[PDB]
Every structure is written in C-alpha cells, then in structure tokens.
Amino acid sequence: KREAEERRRFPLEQRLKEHIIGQESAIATVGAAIRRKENGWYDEEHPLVFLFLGSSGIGKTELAKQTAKYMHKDAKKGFIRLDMSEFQERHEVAKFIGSPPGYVGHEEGGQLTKKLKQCPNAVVLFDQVDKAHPDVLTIMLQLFDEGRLTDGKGKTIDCKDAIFIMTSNVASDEIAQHALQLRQEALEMSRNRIAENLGDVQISDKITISKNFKENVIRPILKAHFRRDEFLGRINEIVYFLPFCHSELIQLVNKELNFWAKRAKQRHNITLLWDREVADVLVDGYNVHYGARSIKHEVERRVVNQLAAAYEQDLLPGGCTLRITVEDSDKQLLKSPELPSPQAEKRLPKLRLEIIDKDSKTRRLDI
Amino acid sequence: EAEERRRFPLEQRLKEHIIGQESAIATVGAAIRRKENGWYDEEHPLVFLFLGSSGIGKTELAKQTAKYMHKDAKKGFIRLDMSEFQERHEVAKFIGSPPGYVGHEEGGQLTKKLKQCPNAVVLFDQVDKAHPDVLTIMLQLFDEGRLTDGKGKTIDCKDAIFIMTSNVASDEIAQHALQLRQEALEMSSDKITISKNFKENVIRPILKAHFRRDEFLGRINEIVYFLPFCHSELIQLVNKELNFWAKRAKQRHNITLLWDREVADVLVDGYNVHYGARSIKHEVERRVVNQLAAAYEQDLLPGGCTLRITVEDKLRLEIIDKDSKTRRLDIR
Amino acid sequence: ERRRFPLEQRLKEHIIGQESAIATVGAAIRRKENGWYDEEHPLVFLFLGSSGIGKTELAKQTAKYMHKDAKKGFIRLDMSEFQERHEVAKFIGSPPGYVGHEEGGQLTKKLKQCPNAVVLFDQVDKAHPDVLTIMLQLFDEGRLTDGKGKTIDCKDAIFIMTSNVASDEIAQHALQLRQEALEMSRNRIAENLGDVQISDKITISKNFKENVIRPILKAHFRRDEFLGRINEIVYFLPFCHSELIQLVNKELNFWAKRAKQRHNITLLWDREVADVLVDGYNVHYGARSIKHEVERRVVNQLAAAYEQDLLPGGCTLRITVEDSDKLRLEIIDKDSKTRRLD
Numbered sequence A: 001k002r003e004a005e006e007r008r009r010f011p012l013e014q015r016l017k018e019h020i021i022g023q024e025s026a027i028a029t030v031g032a033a034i035r036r037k038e039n040g041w042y043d044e045e046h047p048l049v050f051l052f053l054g055s056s057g058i059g060k061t062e063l064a065k066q067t068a069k070y071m072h073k074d075a076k077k078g079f080i081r082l083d084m085s086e087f088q089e090r091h092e093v094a095k096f097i098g099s100p101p102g103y104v105g106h107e108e109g110g111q112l113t114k115k116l117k118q119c120p121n122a123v124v125l126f127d128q129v130d131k132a133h134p135d136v137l138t139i140m141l142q143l144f145d146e147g148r149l150t151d152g153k154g155k156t157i158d159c160k161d162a163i164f165i166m167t168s169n170v171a172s173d174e175i176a177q178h179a180l181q182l183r184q185e186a187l188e189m190s191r192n193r194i195a196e197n198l199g200d201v202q203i204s205d206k207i208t209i210s211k212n213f214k215e216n217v218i219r220p221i222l223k224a225h226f227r228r229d230e231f232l233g234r235i236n237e238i239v240y241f242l243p244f245c246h247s248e249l250i251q252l253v254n255k256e257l258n259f260w261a262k263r264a265k266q267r268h269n270i271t272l273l274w275d276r277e278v279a280d281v282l283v284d285g286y287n288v289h290y291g292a293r294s295i296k297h298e299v300e301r302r303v304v305n306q307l308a309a310a311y312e313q314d315l316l317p318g319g320c321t322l323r324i325t326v327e328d329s330d331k332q333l334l335k336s337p338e339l340p341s342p343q344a345e346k347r348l349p350k351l352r353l354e355i356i357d358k359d360s361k362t363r364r365l366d367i
Numbered sequence B: 001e002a003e004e005r006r007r008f009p010l011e012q013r014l015k016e017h018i019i020g021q022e023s024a025i026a027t028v029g030a031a032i033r034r035k036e037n038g039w040y041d042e043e044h045p046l047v048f049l050f051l052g053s054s055g056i057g058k059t060e061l062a063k064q065t066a067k068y069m070h071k072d073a074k075k076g077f078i079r080l081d082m083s084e085f086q087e088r089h090e091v092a093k094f095i096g097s098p099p100g101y102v103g104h105e106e107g108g109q110l111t112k113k114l115k116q117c118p119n120a121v122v123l124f125d126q127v128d129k130a131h132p133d134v135l136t137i138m139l140q141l142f143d144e145g146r147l148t149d150g151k152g153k154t155i156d157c158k159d160a161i162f163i164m165t166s167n168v169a170s171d172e173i174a175q176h177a178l179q180l181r182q183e184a185l186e187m188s189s190d191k192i193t194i195s196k197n198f199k200e201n202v203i204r205p206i207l208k209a210h211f212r213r214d215e216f217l218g219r220i221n222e223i224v225y226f227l228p229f230c231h232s233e234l235i236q237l238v239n240k241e242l243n244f245w246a247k248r249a250k251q252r253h254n255i256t257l258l259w260d261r262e263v264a265d266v267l268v269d270g271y272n273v274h275y276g277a278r279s280i281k282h283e284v285e286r287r288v289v290n291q292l293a294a295a296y297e298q299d300l301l302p303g304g305c306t307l308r309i310t311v312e313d314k315l316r317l318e319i320i321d322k323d324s325k326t327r328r329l330d331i332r
Numbered sequence C: 001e002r003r004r005f006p007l008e009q010r011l012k013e014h015i016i017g018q019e020s021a022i023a024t025v026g027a028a029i030r031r032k033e034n035g036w037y038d039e040e041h042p043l044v045f046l047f048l049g050s051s052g053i054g055k056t057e058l059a060k061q062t063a064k065y066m067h068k069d070a071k072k073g074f075i076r077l078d079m080s081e082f083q084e085r086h087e088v089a090k091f092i093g094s095p096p097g098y099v100g101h102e103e104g105g106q107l108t109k110k111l112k113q114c115p116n117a118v119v120l121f122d123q124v125d126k127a128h129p130d131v132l133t134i135m136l137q138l139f140d141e142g143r144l145t146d147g148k149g150k151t152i153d154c155k156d157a158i159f160i161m162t163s164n165v166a167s168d169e170i171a172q173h174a175l176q177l178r179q180e181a182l183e184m185s186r187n188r189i190a191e192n193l194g195d196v197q198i199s200d201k202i203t204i205s206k207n208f209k210e211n212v213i214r215p216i217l218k219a220h221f222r223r224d225e226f227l228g229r230i231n232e233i234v235y236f237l238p239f240c241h242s243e244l245i246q247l248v249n250k251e252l253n254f255w256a257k258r259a260k261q262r263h264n265i266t267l268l269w270d271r272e273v274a275d276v277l278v279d280g281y282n283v284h285y286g287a288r289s290i291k292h293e294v295e296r297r298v299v300n301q302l303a304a305a306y307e308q309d310l311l312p313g314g315c316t317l318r319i320t321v322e323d324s325d326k327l328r329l330e331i332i333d334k335d336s337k338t339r340r341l342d
C-alpha cells in the first residue's frame, strides 16, 4: 500500500533524469507506460513491448539497466541481456528454446526459457536487433504476441507481464539528420523571438519528432529491414533517441568530472575542481559515430592517465585541493577561431593539475 | 500432560532453535497440536511435503520436530535419504529381498526400523532425487501406514509421522516471494504470505511433472512451503551464528566475544541468494573463526579476556581491557 | 609441533608455489586441529585450476599430514570411472536381491575402516551430475548408507575435491593480473619506489570469484545446494617464471639425490641450463611439462652414459650451455680438468 506513495515521493522520471540526462521525451514515455503497468491499470493479457531506435552508445542499455534496477533489486536475476549480433544464423534460434528430443542439449533446454522460468516478470533487453536476420525475430513474434514460449521439451512458459525491450541502431542516420534540422529550426525561432524582443513566452528545450516524418520514412524503413509487418504490429511503443545536444553534453562533462571528484574525495579526500575552458576542451572531442563513448574515452585519455600518474607518483597529498587547468600557451590558440590549413597537424591542448594550498598559492605538477 | 505442553508449546522451541519461517513453523505446529489433542484419525498417519530452496531449514525443521516427539533419535527418528534411490531396483532397500535370493534373511531396512519404533518420525530426505517407482512403493505407506516385508511380515505405522523435504517447486515460490520481497517489505505486524490458489494452479503442474501420480499427492496431508530469507532474518542468522561461536568459546575457554550493530552488515554482504543459511554459516566460520584459531595456537588469547570484532576504517579482532584501550592482534 | 613445523612450511618444502592455496588449506586444517571446528559438518574443499599445478599432490600431502603412514587413512575416488548415472551403486553397494549385495560398498567399507580419513574426489568434474546426490547426502551431515542399510557416520572426515572446471578462466585471469602487476612493477622501477616492500600476492578478485566462477560451476555441476554444501573453494594459479626456476631446481635436486643414492654420482648445474630447461615448458601441461622435459634432455643422457659403464662411481658431473643457438655431460676432475662425454 506504500508503493504508490513512494512513487509519488520519488517518481522514476526523476530517477532516470538523475541517472541519464537528455532525451526527456523517451523518459516521459517509458515512465508513463511503466506507471500504467505498475498502477494495475493495464491489460495483463499482453506484455509491455518497447522498441528504442537510437545512435551508437547513446545510453539505451543504460536506460534499460536503470529501469530494471528500479523495477528489481537484483539485476542479475530480474534483468536479462541478449546480444542479437551473435545470433545471425537460424541455429542460434535453437538456443532460445533448446534442441528437439533426440538431439544434443535436449536436457539443457533453452537459456531464455530457463531465464524466464527463473524470473517471469523480468526486464528483458535485446541489443542491436537489426543485426539478427528476422528469422530469429519470428520466435519473438509470438513471444511478444501472447507472452508464452514453447521450448524443445514442450513445456510452455507464460510471461504475460515481462517488459520486453528492443534496442537498435537502424535508421539512426535519418533521425540524426531530421533532428539536426529540428535543432536548426528551433534555434532559428529562438533567435527570431530574441530579435523580436519577446521574452514573455517561455518554451522549454523539448524537441519531439512529428507524426508525418515517422509515417513517411520510419515505418517504411522498418518494414523494409524487418521484412515482416506482423513483427512490427505487436510492438507496444516506438521510442526515438535524439542525437546529442550541446548543453546536455556540457552537463555530461560536468557529471563525468564530478564523479571522479566524488570518488577521489571518497577514497583519499581529494577535492577536484574544474574550469569552463576545461569543459570546452573536453566537449570538443565529440564524435557522433562513437556517441558518448568517444567523449568518455577522450576524458580518460586526457585526465585519467594524468591523475593516475600523479597518484602513483605520490604527488597528491591527503587533504589537498586540486584544480584542472588548460595550458597557458594553448588558451591563445583556443581564442582564435581561424580555419586551419589541411597540411598542418592539429595539437590537442594539454590539461594540467594545480595544487591550491592553505595560503592560496598555486603549485604546478609536471611528470 | 497438558500443563507441560502449555508451558512449552513447540512453536516456542522451534523459534528458539530455528529462525524465520513463521508460517511453516505455525503449519507444522498446528498439525502436531492436532496430533497432540488426540483428535486425529487413528487410521491415517501424518504426511508432509516440504517445498523450499537450498539452505532454508527443512531438514533441520524435521530433525528438531523428531527431537521433540522422541527423546532418542537413534530409535524415534528414521531418516532415509532419497539420493540412493535414483534407480528402479533401489526399491529393494525398503523391503526385504524375495525368498531364495541374496540378503533375504537380512530383511527390510524400513520394516525393521518401523518395527523397532512404530511411533517414530520418518524423514524421506530430498525426495526430488528418488525414482518415481519408489514413490509408488511408499504410496501404501502414506495411504494406510502398512508395509509388507519380503518374508511375508507386515508392519503397521498408523501412529507415525511422515516428513518429506523436496526441492522441486523451490524456484517459483521464491520468485513469488520475490514480488513479496517487493511487496511485504514495502507494505511497511508485516508477514510474507503465499496465495492459496498458487498451490493448486501452478505448483501442481510441477508436482505432476515430477512425481507424475495423482495418488501420491492426494495421499499427502499437508504441503508446507519455505520462504527465502529476508533482510532481518539474515541479520538474525548472522547474530545467531556469532552467538553460537561465542557460546562455544565461553563453554570452552571462557572467551567473551562482542560485535556491534554495524558489524553484521558486512557479513550480510557475504551472502548468495542461490545458497542458504549454510553460506552465512561458513562465511562466519571462515572470516572470523580462523583468526580466533590462529590466535589460539599462538597463545595470544588468555582465558577471561574480552574480544571485539571491528570493521576496518577487514574484520579485526581487538582485545578490550578494563581500561577501555583497544589492542590490535598481530596474526602471523 | 605445529608451532615449529606447521602445515604451511612442510607443504611449501614439499610443493613449490600456490601460496594462497596452501594458506587457505592450512588455515582450515589449523581450525580443525585446534578443536575449534564444528562437529556436524565435515570439511569440503573444491580445488580448481589448470592442469599440472599440484592439487592431487596437495591432497596426498594433507593425507600424510593427518596419518604419518600411507595406504590407510587416505581414500581417493577417481571420478573418471563414475561418468554414468548408475555408478552410484559403486558408492553404496548393491541393493538386496541383486548381484554383489553381500560385498557392500567400497566407499562404505573404506569409511568403516576409519571415519576420520581424508577422502579425495579426484577429477570430480568428469562425473555425471547425478552421482553428486550422494555428495549432497555426505556433505550435508556426514553419514552414508550401505547395501544393507548400515548408516556409517563420517563427521570427522575431510573431503577434498579436485577439478579442472574454469581452468581457462582462472589461468587467463591470472595471466591478466600478472600482466597488470608487471606493468605497474615496471612503472615502479621507472618511478624508483623501492622503499615499500611489494607484497607480490596476486589473488583472484571477489568479483571474478562471484560473477564468472559461480555460474560456470552452476553450469557444470547443475545443482545449487551442492555448491552450497561446499565449504571452501580453493583456486590454483599457474606458475610464474620464478616458480619454474624453483621447480627445475627442485627436480634437479631430486635427480641428483637419486644418483647419490644409486651410485654416489654428485651432479651440478648452472643458472643458464635451468633457464634453457624453463624455455622447454608449456603452460597448458603444467609442471608435468617440466618433468618429462628433464627426461627428454638430462636423464636420458645419463642413462645412455651409464649403459656403457662410463660412470664407475664417485665422479662429479656438470651440465653446460649449448652453442648451437650461438645437453653436455662433463666429468670434472679433482684437479678441475673437465672432460666432455658423448
């Protein structure tokens, strides 16, 4: 009786916003559908079927993992992860259900059948479902249709309430192009409202894909790739992951530096602080092709190796305060927005650690 | 003898010796109280089927029950392990061999044990591992409590109590308790309850897929479920294992042991959901007691001293003197 | 007796390597021998590792520690012959009315001789996973029923189980931990931090102990209460290069001792011939890859020399460095005049 009051205190939209910044339309959609499920105002005869279309490494697996962590205390048993890139051939279809009688691994059964037996209402996630040929997806047709799966032994498992989540990278380029168009148009109307000196109207930064674009391109490309309209029919909701925006990337840089500062304070009482130009240099390495993975690895290659070298060199005393700074001779290069020649090599501006003492004296560290 | 049973009900003894399982203990206590009042049907013995996961306490519950009903377990407790009876011919370990064959004069083991004590509690331990034919052998033992030996002799055990522990439908009820772990703990007395339709709509397909006979499940009087341990039950288990070791130390060499409220959290952190009370038991036995034995060899623990388990700012054993000064022990 | 020559030092002199494994085994043996062990539960150890590490020899030396004599208090069952479901009767004897009922079980008779014995289930991963229901019964309380129903108590026994499951996992993670330790050690050589004594005890991390090893044991053994009843799980790491040097030195000590007992032929060697013996080694075959290699390089040459009576007795030998990349048995004289033998 206290679960609805707890969710009234801390809804999952705030929990997911704390865990993952950006794409608040996706958060609102998954929160509303989950709220319909967990309130009880939901048709139990069919499972909750999510499809996420996104770019590479945008946080879809993190979103499903945090959803399963919110739903279940144990994510080892209450959450299932399956990589569809491995399951190219129809032979891998067998390991959903196990072999027929008379064959090898008949007593083994299916891994998925035993996994749904061990947790019938688990959050189940398949990543990159476009990699698998839809002959694999033909099992999941009836599995999303009625929640019942038949194995090789003939035991029928019934999971009518399991949240089944698909995540895919298909049509990521078209969503990226259209969302770049919408970002340019929204910046155009924002600058029009600025130039008309109208500040009474307040519009939040919520850009949502319109219906006509979806009906024009997304349903035909999904029908063409999946080659089966029936598999697209059982999907309870489609969700679009918009490509990364500037201010949320800045907030991402702030949080991925803040986590290292918090773990430094937790382990060795090391208070790390940052600069705005440090955040600019870290957000400069933004690659859409790797998604947030490129920014995270750029953060690692820039500051994590330097902080590790300072830690193993024992040059960070306990109880001290540290500041991450940009090199002085590179800020002048940052201040010049000139187009570089293609025959000149590009130099990454270095990052340094400064010690702030009790007498407000800056100490430099070079290793 | 009603005064003695009013002084010491078996629920008090069971809660004194095993923790958790407030519904299973109450169920077996209600059945044993029905036996104690003299208003059970004297033609039919009591049959129990225990459904629980690993390390929950079914075998210990049967042992403590048969310790209550009979003072000697060498006569009043007959335990047969079904791990031998994996094959169809293993049936011949209950009854005697047919006449003219090997071991015919040796007789039936279960018939001899029931003839030694007809009131004795019989524990069919781990009845998952039995062959389905052995189930049909003890079909008549549950139907009337009457078993025919290989020599033509026939033993009656209408007054006996039959306990079986099983592992077959242990996952699903645990999964059921999983939502109860997200409901009964979030209901905040508070209790963890298994729904009444569950035992007939879902559990009976597993019981029919494993035991395959309607008559075997019909002959069993009571189906007793065992629920997985909660957080407070794991706390009580940690304190019970530590109190067992402290009592053993005080009985052996007069060594007082202390643990704070904060110490039990890192011991509950050493727990497997697939395991049971034995995981917490040997985790206590390894992490704490090995340092005690190492200090006891090294003569670092004189008798009458007071020891405190402290979490590192590792479980460190600190000697507490009368002057409130902690002394760390350096173990080689 | 334990305070001067414990299990740790005798095991380290008899078996090289496996510091944490001997530490865990001797800690549990210490708590058993002090009298601070629980009487109900017999000790269950599951030994995991690659091939040629020394788990069977560790169990043999533990059994010789319990009973100074051999052949009596050491009951070893090899689960290569237990790969069928119907081999359970080999534990317990035949049921009444069937062939071999009067002979009883062999395990029952051997635990009837002595109940405090060291029982070694060797290569226990090879057994069919219905045989281990008897292991459920025996590890639960320590009692075993015969063909005639005679329940034998076994509460003073020590059960040691050796296996090869997760051998690739343990070996590959130990190789990664060795690589990372060598990287940070080479950095420490670069950083000149020699003022801190480096405790070179590479152990398996608890995340690796709990997230990959427990699922693969659950996949091979196919039961959860079985892994619950196992008290201690002891891993075995593969050797590092210093351990190979110590092992080749120990084996050459063994062969020099054998020659001294046979015809008093004192034998000597050098560091470089030990290094070229360590070069002939494979990580999969383990210490056996060392052992026969000596017989493929050294002892065959001594046997060939002794067949044509070239070593009458009392002579001193030395083994040298090959020049083909740039083994020789050399008799050294009392005047230090070496002579090569063919």
Ligand SMILES: Nc1ncnc2c1ncn2[C@@H]1O[C@H](COP(=O)(O)OP(=O)(O)OP(=O)(O)O)[C@@H](O)[C@H]1O
Residues within 6 Å of the ligand: B017, B018, B019, B020, B021, B053, B054, B055, B056, B057, B058, B059, B060, B061, B165, B167, B237, B240, B276, B277, B278, B281, C140, C225
């Ligand atoms: N509820 C409990 N309270 C206290 N101690 C317990 C409890 N359950 C188990 N234990 C301890 O753990 C041991 C394991 O229990 P036991 O050997 O009786 O089997 P079990 O838990 O019924 O499981 P299995 O089905 O594997 O036999 C007990 O001997 C006892 O020492």
Ligand SMILES: Nc1ncnc2c1ncn2[C@@H]1O[C@H](COP(=O)(O)OP(=O)(O)OP(=O)(O)O)[C@@H](O)[C@H]1O
Residues within 6 Å of the ligand: C014, C015, C016, C017, C050, C051, C052, C053, C054, C055, C056, C057, C058, C162, C163, C164, C286, C287, C288
């Ligand atoms: N660590 C070691 N130290 C010394 N000798 C060893 C060691 N490992 C193996 N040996 C030698 O090699 C022999 C083979 O080892 P053993 O019989 O103990 O099996 P093992 O290494 O556990 O192999 P497997 O796991 O394949 O059964 C030993 O009898 C001993 O002579």
Ligand SMILES: [Mg+2]
Residues within 6 Å of the ligand: B055, B056, B057, B058, B059, B060, B061
């Ligand atoms: Mg128990």
Ligand SMILES: [Mg+2]
Residues within 6 Å of the ligand: C054, C055, C056, C057, C162
């Ligand atoms: Mg071996």
